[PDB]
Amino acid sequence: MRVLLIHSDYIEYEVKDKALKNPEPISEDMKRGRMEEVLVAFISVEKVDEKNPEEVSLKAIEEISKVAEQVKAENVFVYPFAHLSSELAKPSVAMDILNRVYQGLKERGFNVGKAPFGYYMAFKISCKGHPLAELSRTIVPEEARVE
Amino acid sequence: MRVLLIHSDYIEYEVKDKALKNPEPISEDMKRGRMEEVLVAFISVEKVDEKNPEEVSLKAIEEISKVAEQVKAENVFVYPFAHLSSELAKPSVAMDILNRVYQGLKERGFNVGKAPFGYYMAFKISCKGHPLAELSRTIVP
Ligand SMILES: Nc1ncnc2c1ncn2[C@@H]1O[C@H](CO)[C@@H](NC(=O)[C@@H](N)CO)[C@H]1O
Ligand SMILES: Nc1ncnc2c1ncn2[C@@H]1O[C@H](CO)[C@@H](NC(=O)[C@@H](N)CO)[C@H]1O
């Protein structure tokens, strides 16, 4: 998994066109959204993550939470951004992992938001430009899952 | 080299704290900038690129130009974005390669801009959200 963390004044998004034949079923209101003072987690789920969705998600939750703790962010936004990596995981796995990360951050007590999966999407962001407002993290499985 | 290409309605930046002991000296007017209807090239120069700066730069110019034509972008912005890679080239080489890419794109007729090198920088961007508005490329010797 590849994650780009941008501590921003805000994030706005707008669904523009489906990118998959059968994207995530969303309501009209889910097509657009905005969150203030937010640590945006742009995430690309990679092929190697398919080995252990649970472990990778756990590590991602841990890494993202740590950064939020360092920059004092109370709001976190999970944003699908497939082209952060060149070796993408299958859609079904990507969606599952993104959901796991989203739920995990919620469990940690953060106010969490997320954009719909499977779409070409426009977005506006405003990076704060502080030393830790722009970071990258690579997270991968250490062991295959047992299920 | 790791390149993240975002076709945007605009890109704005503001130089803040230095991120290197001795960054690129700049004037007050250079601390801020904006470009519209632009293909933003977020670039991270990698350690392996140090082997052949000219080759990597040439290839980067070719690929970025290709995308610009595909999306019909007349404006291109070279944006230092170190985080895209773990194996970074040393500052002096990284800046030289970014300038080489800048010059190559400028040579081709594009309206090109670039941000100061060696700083933490605030920025505002608006991704168009078209199918080709977000792309990544890996270019190495
Ligand atoms: N491995 C992966 N990691 C993250 N997202 C992935 C994915 N595979 C498929 N997607 C989803 O399908 C859209 C088109 O690739 C993706 N859309 C996007 O990444 C938008 N930013 C495009 O504007 C995303 O919703
Ligand atoms: N290998 C490399 N590739 C691209 N840029 C590099 C670099 N090595 C050093 N820099 C410059 O120094 C700042 C801190 O790494 C970098 N700053 C940035 O990447 C800002 N976006 C941080 O907000 C950049 O100006």
Numbering used by the authors:
A (entry chain B): 1 to 147
B (entry chain A): 1 to 141
Give verbatim lines from the article.
We have been interested in a D-aminoacyl-tRNA deacylase (DTD) fold that is present across the domains of life in two different functional contexts: as an N-terminal editing domain (NTD) of archaeal ThrRS, which specifically removes non-cognate L-serine mischarged on tRNAThr, and as a freestanding ‘chiral proofreading' enzyme, which removes D-amino acids from tRNAs in bacteria and eukaryotes. Both share a striking structural and mechanistic similarity highlighting a common ancestry. Here we show, with the help of structural, biochemical and biophysical studies from three distant organisms, that the substrate specificity in this domain is determined by a differential remodelling of the catalytic centre at the RNA–protein interface rather than just the presence or absence of catalytic water as previously proposed. While demonstrating that the tRNA provides the catalytic group, we show that the side chains within the recognition site are dispensable for the proofreading function, suggesting a primordial mode of protein- or peptide scaffold-based enzymatic activity evolved alongside that of RNA.
On the other hand, the Lys to Met mutant, although showed partial activity against L-Ser-(Ec)tRNAThr in our earlier work, in subsequent studies with not only PabNTD K121M but also the corresponding K116M and K122M mutants of ApNTD and MjNTD with multiple batches of protein showed a severely compromised activity, suggesting a crucial role of this residue in enzyme function. However, a direct role of Lys in catalysis is still highly unlikely considering that this position is naturally occupied by a Met in the structural homologue DTD. We solved the crystal structure of K121M mutant of PabNTD and K116M mutant of ApNTD with L-Ser3AA and L-Thr3AA to investigate the structural basis of the observed loss of activity. A significant repositioning of the crucial catalytic water was observed upon mutation of the polar Lys side chain to the non-polar Met side chain, which is present in DTD. This provides a clear structural basis for the loss of function in this mutant, despite its high binding affinity for the substrate. Therefore, we show that Lys plays a crucial role in positioning the water molecule for catalysis rather than acting as a nucleophile.
